[PDB]
Symmetry: C2
Subunit: 305 residues, 2 copies
């Protein structure tokens, strides 16, 4: 059978799978009652994509479609969604939302761009700053549309792309990276979600690949934690190696010295735990990377780090 | 002989591929009739056994991005002077054998996007701002090899603080045309570019370059946003991981429809990391949505491709 493996990539060679920026650091968080259930950056070790996860970093928190109405909501521009590859989005599909849809509560700011097709000035373009709030009642991507705000009113009912740049609070409504938006809007339930993940033992904590993304004013730190980086997801999808157990053993190695620095559990659902107690931002050598050593199980006792 | 790791391509459809010269998906395949223009792009350059070249790095998020600090507000058209770090935040060294910091744009024109800041130090640390910004590679202040570029903004809410530029699209620079095959002057006016990945061209009669084409966003006007890359970013990432030894200068690759099993056409994947096909004239390909290239065998410079 095809052997499981990790790609060989340093921290600065990795992309955040929940926002299209490089990984900045590794962080392990103290356990709490709040649920970790992100929908982007979800993939099993044998390469099954889950939630709203797709392969491209350019897909993450991006939208593609057409503006089909200009309204007088604060979120003025009504954007009917396609799939990111331009095919027609089907709301009855067994996904939470179109692949790449944001999986947090707050705003994503960026640029909405257009290129005309059809009889009305085909090939004419425009691009302006735009904001999408996932708190908005018009944020209904599962149903097939989202609305965006712009200070500019130079927009047409034409094919549209949204490129994310950063995140922020939505005025008084805080940026909450672990709170899912209501993909179908108010008074509806989310469906087809990737499951929540948690340590099976109190001495273990989730380990995150952490990014500090851009913010558009205020003092928000722009913290976006992902379970596994986008490149691991891409790698597992290509490889499709069969998982021999529920838990893979991985070691963080310094190639400069050859030393193993610490070990971790890489679970079959696609997340990592370490033996540690408390919030801890790791300090690791620049050339360090995770190495897959063996299939183990839940009853492996991780060396404390 | 000893064994060697087999060469391969990742299995990805066109819409599962990223342009290696601008951070957007591939839209189509295009083969161009030979013409007066020279192809010497610096992004999206990698050998088949995984050696990155030019200004090529691994992250799509790296492509046409900048990281550094705004160290001055000037009187240039490109007002804000941005001293560069490497994209991973380490200090940039102008004496390194690269054309410019990795990820630097490799075309003449404008990249528009957003410049963002987060303060450190004594002055309101942790405060942020982000605004539309434009960087022109025609600019005399575009001197990334020397360690800086300048950007424009209609907004003047910028500070001398850690700064990132996130690219969104391209355009012409006013009267100066967007030229994807013209390199910027990385060290500025009246200086020479160095350490470049080499020019690329068909060496065999009846053959043309095949491009992975994207139509990227533009910020007004009718520019088509056409950015062609020699190989998509995932192929580069794949070769970098695999490091499979090249058995030849030319790999024979075939475009396959997995639904039917049918081979649609064949192409030469040259060791330098570009593709040629047997065709005469400009030709926008029509291919099935599920199609992808498959590596079949190593051949040589005198292999004769079936016409497509």
């Amino acid at each position: 059978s095809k052997p499981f493996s990790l790609p060989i990539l340093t921290l600065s060679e990795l992309t955040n799978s929940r926002f299209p920026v490089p990984i900045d650091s590794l962080f392990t968080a103290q356990n709490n009652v709040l649920q970790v259930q992100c929908q982007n950056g979800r993939c099993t070790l044998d390469g099954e994509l889950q939630g709203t996860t797709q392969l491209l970093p350019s897909g993450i928190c991006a939208f593609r479609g057409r503006v089909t109405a200009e309204t007088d909501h604060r979120d003025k521009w009504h954007m009917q969604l396609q799939n990111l590859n331009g095919t027609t989005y089907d709301p009855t599909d067994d996904v939470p939302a179109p692949l790449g849809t944001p999986d947090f509560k707050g705003v994503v700011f960026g640029v909405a761009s257009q290129r005309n097709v059809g009889n009305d000035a085909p090939g004419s373009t425009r691009a302006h700053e735009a904001v999408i709030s996932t708190y908005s009642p018009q944020f209904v991507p599962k149903l097939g549309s989202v609305n965006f705000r712009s200070n500019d009113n130079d927009f047409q009912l034409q094919p549209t792309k949204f490129t994310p740049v950063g995140i922020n609070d939505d005025g008084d409504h805080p940026f909450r990276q672990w709170e899912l938006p209501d993909y179908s809007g108010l008074l509806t339930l989310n469906m087809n979600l990737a499951p929540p993940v948690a340590p099976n033992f109190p001495g273990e904590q989730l380990l995150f690949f952490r990014s500090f993304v851009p913010c558009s004013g205020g003092y928000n730190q722009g913290i976006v934690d992902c379970l596994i980086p986008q490149e691991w997801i891409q790698h597992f999808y290509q490889e499709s190696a069969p998982s021999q157990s529920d838990v893979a053993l991985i070691r963080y190695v310094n190639p400069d010295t050859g030393r193993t620095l610490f070990e971790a559990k890489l679970h079959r659902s696609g997340y990592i735990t370490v033996a540690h107690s408390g919030d801890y931002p790791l300090v690791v050598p620049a050339n360090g990377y995770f190495r897959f050593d063996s299939w183990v199980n839940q009853f492996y006792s991780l060396a404390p780090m």
